Subunit: 292 residues, 4 copies
């Protein structure tokens, strides 16, 4: 599944920074019960940056095992070296994942042609559906609509997670791709607007703690019921913003702890513990959403 | 050690994308003959993004072996996970390098507290001198002067490569740190200005192909001869700019090949070969500098 | 009328820079025949910057005389001194204009409270409907949704021309104002998207040369027929962009000349004649729109 | 004439918003006693935006009368219509001012060719020396070094007030103009850096309230005594920043009133009175500078 509310799930950790299977189970069960469409395993919110490839693969496999066929899993598989992205992708071939979420190379700032070659090469070497991921604020590059157009002609490049927050991208991309290419927001605060313009869903941070409301908002949006969806979005908007009051996923992990969904809010350096002021801000946003 | 013209050396490759020892030897000999002060091995221009940690270490070690004590070698040791940066640094402990160039975490956009903890932890696991490296256009994060001041209190944090191109940073940082903290430009086009404001040298892309001119410029700067230095700077300014006409190190590799310094201009994906228009632009800049 | 396609009309000039009544007549007749909703007289596109208040008033009065009740006229009345905006507004009281388009103060960068006091004072001293105008790229300030909310409580502040091109503003403003407050795009390239998100129309540059297609696009949008509207927008998109290839209204005045709607393309300094390359670009966009 | 510490003097007002002659006299006497090099009358800090051309001229003439030959006076003469800038400049021909400070057109965002024609036309209608003024945050346009070079060829275009805060501009401009073209900072916080790179002085906001310190800083800079100058700069740095805590000249007027230099801190809308929090911030900065 690549439409609706898709959660970019936290990778819950014990006090030593290792994956907590009991906490992950509790989250997966929460998502299955709350109508979430799919789980993105080891995306940005899942601390792809600080897991090594072996730990990253373990978390994906654990998520698949725990999901037990009840909800589709999409693995984060991006890298800034095209060889490394190919290598990682191969680890998930025949794993049970339904697709891959593959970020534009970060740090090395490739040209558009470089992005086109990168993603084309990755797609060539798997049969799994690829979802492109553009997030210039993190990577230093910006995958532009014209290049997305070129890449959407590759059979298994099936959609994009567009995280610029620049809503003009929706119809710039739509007009260059086929009707079956999936356009997904990667920016919770602008995601309803993104769907109202023609987007098909959201890969969401907020969904980690407001799964049912996100699932209903996206269904209403898909049906055209934008005023109804906006009521929900209004209750969630402080959370959409304040989950970024300190770097993601610091706030959302604390929120998950506060609700009891995970045992600890531990992250890996260079992510640090939430500040007291951030705890107060996040708490207030949770209460506005009706979650506490 | 850490003053004058420091080259961020290319990692020359064969056609297969692996290090070319004969080319590396030719470059290192060139920098020795030219008066380059030190070599940064596997920085940004050295393709740190696309070498694995083993390959990266092999290049550092080969570069030290070839330098043969004639020219000091600083290793790139950055990582966006603190654990990984500690592991990489540890590879070089007792190696012969004279210090490490450690970039702020990329992609995960840590807070200033996170940057402080990251670099403090790395410094605690080594005796080698650490040069911080701030390059927000690539990383998505900006190590601010206040935090540089905080880190400068750690015994073996001894300088910064400041690649914002924001010259106000020179005296902001200088006022918060001791007189022996080293300020180095990471932006060739502004570097002479940077030294004019108080900085101590440059970690340079341009020095790959204009080593003698860069070293002469920097010597003139250190002696307070800015007008003489500026004549050299004006001859090099088109190269300083046009070596970024396409993403670094695509142009500077091509230029090295054109000058006979390396055997091939091969890079690793997602870096792609220079375009015809790029060749013509860089060619013109080399001509303007008197190098061709 | 404050919904649909509203043209920010050129102020056509003879070779001496004085208003050409014959050309203005021809444009007004064109707009009446083409279904344009209203005319904004002496907006940005009408060279408000370079007419003095007397010439500005003359152009508004001439436009009203020529319109002859067949199409509503809205006057540009903004200023960067609140006294001057009040003064100008008074000149149009009982003129026959239906409302005023009042830009945020430019150059002096007032606070939000300063904008609130400015516009509140202007509204206080007229009975005419006021349309706020936010265009940060020109003015150096940005009238934020929270302040728009406060101002919409003033009886005769009835809407906003939102020219940031930042589409998140539509629903940020909508949720703070009553259902009868008019949200109008001031950015042609994003205007259909702006209407799709809840906007009511556009105050348009493109409409000066594509009046019928703009009028139909906005009607289709108002009816919810966005796919049909987008077909039109696709044919117009090169014009939406290339009418800004050189500073507005340089391109649109040349376009109006080329179509025969005005006798000369003259502007006032510091606007200069269109370049040959700009003529070629604009011509190509006109042909894409089917206008030549 | 055009070196050292030049004050962009406030236009002190009574409670009605009209010039206060007794206050203006007190300020001018202060600048004479302090060693200020020249006074810019009705620049940005002087509320050029909210004075009409008659009122503006009255203030310039009163300032010259009060200066009584003791201190040179430069008039603000900018306008965003070329005709209006020529008319304003003509008011001062044969007045006794020593030159004009002429800002790039604001709001209408002319091209570089337009900027060239604007300033060339203004220069042709006067014998007075012209200082260009670039302040893109306020105007929406950026007079680039190449164009400054082109204009510097006009006999009576003799310098620039560079208020970008982009210190690379100093040597970019200096390389394109003659040795006697004057480079002045328009950004107090970077001005000492600006002089360190080659600039000749500053047109300052801070000098309204720290005149003696500013003049001493600038003298030390001209003599090459940067470290001594920097101690003064460090004492003033909070004022350099916090005089923009609210929009200029709201804080600097308040500060003048607090110091007994002016009778009232009144400004014209859309500038509003300083907030309580602003008073506390500016108070603290004045204390840090040793002025209170
Ligand atoms: K990593
Ligand atoms: K395939
Ligand atoms: K496809
Ligand atoms: K230290
Ligand atoms: K004007
Ligand atoms: K009223
Ligand atoms: K109202
Ligand atoms: K000159």
């Amino acid at each position: 599944m690549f439409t609706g509310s898709i959660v970019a799930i936290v990778t819950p950790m014990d006090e030593k920074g290792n994956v907590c299977r009991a906490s992950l189970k509790k989250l997966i069960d929460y998502h299955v019960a709350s109508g979430t469409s799919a789980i993105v395993s080891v995306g940005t919110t899942g601390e792809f940056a600080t897991l090594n490839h072996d730990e990253h693969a373990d978390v994906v496999m654990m998520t698949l095992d725990l999901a037990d066929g009840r909800i589709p899993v999409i693995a984060g598989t991006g890298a800034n070296a095209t060889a490394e992205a190919i290598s990682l992708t191969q680890r998930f071939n025949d794993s049970g994942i339904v697709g891959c979420l593959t970020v534009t190379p970060y740090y090395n700032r490739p040209s558009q042609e470089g992005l086109y070659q990168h993603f084309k090469a990755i797609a060539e070497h798997t049969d799994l559906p690829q979802i492109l991921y553009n997030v210039p604020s993190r990577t230093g590059c910006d995958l532009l609509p014209e290049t997305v157009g070129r890449l959407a002609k590759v059979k298994n490049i099936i959609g994009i997670k567009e995280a610029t927050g620049n809503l003009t991208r929706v119809n710039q991309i739509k007009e260059l791709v086929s009707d079956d290419f999936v356009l997904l927001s990667g920016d919770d605060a602008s995601a309803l607007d993104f769907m109202q313009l023609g987007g098909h869903g959201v890969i969401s941070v907020t969904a980690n703690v407001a799964a049912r409301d996100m699932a209903q908002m996206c269904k209403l949006a898909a049906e055209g019921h934008f005023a109804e969806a906006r009521v929900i979005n209004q209750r969630l908007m402080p959370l959409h913003n304040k989950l970024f009051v300190e770097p993601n996923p610091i706030p959302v992990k604390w929120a998950c702890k506060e609700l009891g969904l995970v045992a600890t809010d531990t992250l890996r350096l260079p992510m640090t513990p939430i500040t007291d002021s951030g705890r107060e801000t996040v708490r207030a946003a949770l209460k506005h959403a009706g979650l506490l």
